[PDB]
Amino acid sequence: VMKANVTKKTLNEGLGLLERVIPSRSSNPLLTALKVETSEGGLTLSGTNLEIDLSCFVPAEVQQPENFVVPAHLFAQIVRNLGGELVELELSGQELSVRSGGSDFKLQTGDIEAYPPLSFPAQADVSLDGGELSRAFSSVRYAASNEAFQAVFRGIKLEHHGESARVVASDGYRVAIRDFPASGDGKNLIIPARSVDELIRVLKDGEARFTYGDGMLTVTTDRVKMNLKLLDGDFPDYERVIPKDIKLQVTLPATALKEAVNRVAVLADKNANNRVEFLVSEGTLRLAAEGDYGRAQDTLSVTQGGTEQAMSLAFNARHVLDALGPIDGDAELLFSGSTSPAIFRAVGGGGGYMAVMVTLR
Amino acid sequence: VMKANVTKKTLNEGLGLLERVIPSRSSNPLLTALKVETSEGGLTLSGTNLEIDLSCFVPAEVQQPENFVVPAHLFAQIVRNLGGELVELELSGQELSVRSGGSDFKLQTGDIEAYPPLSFPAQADVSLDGGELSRAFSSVRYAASNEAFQAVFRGIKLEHHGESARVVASDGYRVAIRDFPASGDGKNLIIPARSVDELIRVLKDGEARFTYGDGMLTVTTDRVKMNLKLLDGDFPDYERVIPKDIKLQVTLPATALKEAVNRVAVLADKNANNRVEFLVSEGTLRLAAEGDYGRAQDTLSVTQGGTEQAMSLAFNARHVLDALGPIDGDAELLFSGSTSPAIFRAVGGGGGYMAVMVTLR
């Protein structure tokens, strides 16, 4: 019979990744299954949620390899709860045995013949660092909206520029951009935002390889392969909504600003777009909000420069916090005018991140 | 005008206790309010959820003391978010100012005149150690059920026995008991289980004083005063369901047993009472469960004694884990028969805790 010896730690890692993708509930009885393919070198764990496919390799010693399906979440739970560090798998008839020390678990297996063949192409069309790509994704993802009229804005654009690459998200008004190092000569892609979320969960430091397909992308890392759909169309010209006529620059500690926006926003009305006023004057930034319960003000010392010495602006506090999220150390706020867009970034644009914010009307 | 200076740490502690009791939403507009009473020595924070009343004293420096009401959760949230270590309160008209460092918050106060006078009687009728009482409560609370036919079983019985006291909870079948040290003699009481939960949240090491009332109890500690209802009726004779004829005793590590029951129970049927089979023989305990998805077994080494050398029983795994919760180190399991009740306790009954468990049909 088929028998495999595998490390619990490694099997846990793979199953943890797959259980977050595979649905726990479905009217399709096989959609909740994990497919396990065995060969000499180890186990390949795979599944789908119909928007992405995921495969993870787990090194193992296997005899008499055979493929099977089991309920993904139950199997992950059983393995997690096992006491020992080394796991024995055995497949006999329609029963998977999962053993470690005094523990002996049996799972009924499913209809492997009815589970779809999942194919992951390998051609290394582009290569970049997965950690760089993941942190870039995480820095811009908030700006994409599934509800935008333009379908393209529901995804994240990836651009290649030789020695570097860029990811961009937007709703047509706010924009988030992060530039990062790339081994870079590839094509522009638009990745669905929910697929970026899955990518973030699997990418680690080290090389990530892209294989281009027809309306799809395959991303391969150390041990993981993921299929995802790509959006059609050209991402819009976001450069046009980035302000270049800056009148006022304010520099201040990022953490103080985040904590000040957070605390003041509690008194903004439940829905007047979480309104927060920014008043720059005399080397200070005052934040103000007001609603039915009361009113809040917080005042911060800042360094200010430019052709205006004072400015009053209104922003969605939640969007402010979204935009500031990736900024650490000191923030630089660049204002084009009291009712026109602003840029938030780290000092000098260091790290490659930039947010464009619109004011409330 | 009224003005108070208070440490943020101490104000946070008091507000944290009150916000747990005061509802965050109600059709009664004042029920969600915190009452704040000021005097020279500090602030008294009070409120109600209609089942309990709670009052907490926070030391502060106050000028021109005056009372007011404010929304409890909003106020607690504003204070938590403050950046500095000192809070300044100021009351002018219907506006409470809350200030720390660069932060200045204004809250609209409510109709203090329409907030009920809450009264906390002081007569020290009995005195117990709050830490002992809290740990006893926590050891038996799980056994009480709000869904029991007999209203008395929805509460926790407190019994006085001179230098010792006892708390007991039950659903008429399972029983949890903890004996603990008591300072002098008192009245037997039945405390509603949800009020025990609130008491657990406020009790600390040190003295807790009881003031008896008509169908109610007031508990006073260093920090707080709490009013709660008491249940009427006679707590039933739980002694009669405690097995006296023990045939088999097994001793083993409580943590190993908890982890084994937990892992095996995953394969019990979604509702056959979380069935786990216990098989004792030849110095081992084997746990087994089985359902539609598969089957599980775990085996543990135990020490064993008594008139029977082997026994097979079935238990609700959830009730097993409830019963083992308070046991640290070695657990002693005492069986009266394959389908009659069992006792779970620490070695020798040490610590004063005992659980009585019924078997499944």
Numbering used by the authors:
A (entry chain A), B (entry chain B): 1 to 361
Paper text:
The bacterial DNA polymerase III β subunit (β-clamp), and the corresponding eukaryotic and archaeal proliferating cell nuclear antigen (PCNA) are ring-shaped proteins that encircle double-stranded DNA. They act as a processivity factor, or a sliding clamp, for a wide variety of proteins that act on DNA including DNA polymerases, DNA ligase, endonucleases and glycosylases. In this paper, we describe the crystallographic structure of the DNA polymerase III β-clamp from the extremely radiation resistant bacterium Deinococcus radiodurans (Drβ-clamp).
The crystal structure of Drβ-clamp was determined in space group P3221 to 2.0 Å resolution using molecular replacement. Despite our efforts, the DNA oligomer the Drβ-clamp was co-crystallised with was not clearly visible in the electron density, and could not be modelled into the structure. The overall structure of Drβ-clamp is similar to E.coli β-clamp (Ecβ-clamp) and consists of a dimer which forms a ring lined by 12 α-helices, with an opening big enough to accommodate dsDNA. The shape of the Drβ-clamp dimer is slightly more elliptic than that of the circular Ecβ-clamp, with an internal diameter of 32 to 41 Å. In E. coli, M. tuberculosis and T. maritima clamps the positive charge forms a relatively continuous band pattern across the surface whereas in Drβ-clamp the charge is more spread forming small positive patches separated by negatively charged areas. The Drβ-clamp dimer interfaces have a spread, even charge distribution compared to the very strong positive (N-terminal domain) and negative charge (C-terminal domain) of the Ecβ-clamp interfaces. In Drβ-clamp these tyrosines are substituted by Ala151 and Val152, which may explain why the DNA is bound in a too disorganised fashion to be clearly visible in the electron density.
